[PDB]
A paper describes a structure:
The hybrid promiscuous (Hypr) [name] enzyme GSU1658 (renamed GacA for GMP-AMP cyclase) was hypothesized to regulate a new signaling pathway through activation of [name]-specific GEMM-Ib riboswitches in Geobacter sulfurreducens, an environmental bacterium known for its unique ability to perform extracellular electron transfer and accelerate bioremediation of subsurface contaminants. GacA has an N-terminal CheY-like receiver domain and a C-terminal [name] domain. In contrast, GacA is a homodimeric enzyme that has one nucleotide substrate binding site per [name] domain, or half of the active site per monomer. In this work, we show for the first time that GacA specifically affects [name] levels and [name] riboswitch transcripts in G. sulfurreducens and is important during bacterial growth on particulate acceptors, such as mineral Fe(III) oxides.
To gain insight into the molecular basis for function and mechanism of this signaling enzyme, we pursued structural characterization of the GacA [name] domain from Geobacter metallireducens in the presence of GTP, and obtained a 1.4 Å resolution x-ray crystal structure as an N-terminal fusion with T4 [name]. The GacA [name] domain has a βααββαβαβ global topology that positions one guanosine substrate above the signature [G/A/S]G[D/E]E[F/Y] motif and can be overlaid with a canonical [name] domain with an RMSD value of 1.152 Å. Electron density for three guanine nucleotides was found in the GacA structure, two in nucleotide-interacting regions that are conserved in other [name] domains. One guanine nucleotide is bound near the canonical allosteric inhibitory site (I-site) and the second nucleotide is bound in the active site above the [name] motif. The final guanosine nucleotide binds at the T4 [name]-[name] interface and may act to stabilize the construct in a way that ATP cannot. Our structure of the Hypr [name] domain with bound guanosine plus PPi shows that two specific hydrogen-bonding interactions are made with the nucleobase, a Watson-Crick interaction with Ser348 and a sugar-face interaction with Asn339. In particular, a magnesium ion coordinates to the β and γ phosphates and is held in place by the side chain of Asp374 in the [name] motif. To interact with serine, which is a shorter side chain than aspartate, the guanosine shifts toward the α2 helix in the Hypr [name] compared to GTP in the canonical structure. In both dimer structures, the glutamate residue that is the fourth residue in [name] is close to the GTP/guanosine:PPi bound to the opposite monomer, and in the case of GacA, is oriented appropriately to deprotonate the 3’ hydroxyl group from the substrate.
Author numbering: -162 to 163
Write the structure that this text describes.
Amino acid sequence: MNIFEMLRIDQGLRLKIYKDTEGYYTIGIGHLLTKSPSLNAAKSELDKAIGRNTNGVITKDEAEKLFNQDVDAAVRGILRNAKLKPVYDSLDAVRRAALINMVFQMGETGVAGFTNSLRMLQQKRWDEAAVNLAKSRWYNQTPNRAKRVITTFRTGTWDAYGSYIDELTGLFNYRYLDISLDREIKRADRFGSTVSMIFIDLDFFKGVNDTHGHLVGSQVLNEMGMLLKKSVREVDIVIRYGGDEFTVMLVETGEKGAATVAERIRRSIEGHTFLAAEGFNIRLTASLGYACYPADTQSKLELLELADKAMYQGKEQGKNCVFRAT
Ligand SMILES: Nc1nc2c(ncn2[C@@H]2O[C@H](CO)[C@@H](O)[C@H]2O)c(=O)[nH]1
Ligand SMILES: [Mg+2]
């Protein structure tokens, strides 16, 4: 965990322009391009910011450079702010990340208005700072993010963000499904775009544990996570759940893209030899099901239900297959 991954959890990563909660054109890890209603003005600013003719689309490397520029500007502003500089200078690196996080969300002036919280932070009175931080419009507006940021100030650890990471595979875990889904569905609702969910369940995975032992099976799941990430884009969200069950949430594409990605995943699993560098010859297939929002449903919960039912239909009809919700 680090400040990039922390803000990616809180703000997502997007490689095409989207609209934030106020309707403002944004890209990357929460980089506001403009408040202008003009998409053209947003694209002209994006080209200046990246230093390329982007037509509204950037690479992950570009988004992370833009993010680092935004962190540097937040720190330089903190250091020029008489109320924030002494607190920042006094904090350790993790708690500085929490302060920067607040500046990303609400701006420097907003953070500087946390008079009593800042006092307690400068005095290392962590529990009192956490109580004071929650007495704010910020906490009420975004309580889940504020609780994470507050826990980071209270503890000085990354644990509130690490609890979204699956230890075995390094993928996101089931706790991230709520956050990521709610966020990309809302962004799609504002923008008129599509979100698709793909459920993937390995076929006969118990047979790997039976033949090679559970430690080998766990390494197969780790390699499966790597293969899924290689098969999708950096804006797509890959989660493990549980056991040999994974989800992929597709962002920034449509129904045709969902079909293409699900078929690519199925084919890539079927063609892959697992643990080959360790001398194994493990072969697997998977059953996949997917559904698209808003085409197939206008309920996020139903979207999950339909993709899972489509996957199970594949399981019942021979496995090694992809079904879209009917
Ligand atoms: N090796 C291994 N097997 C698992 C893990 N999680 C679930 N499983 C097994 O995968 C099978 C899925 O049906 C079940 O027997 C689970 O016990 C894991 O982390 N490692
Ligand atoms: Mg299975």
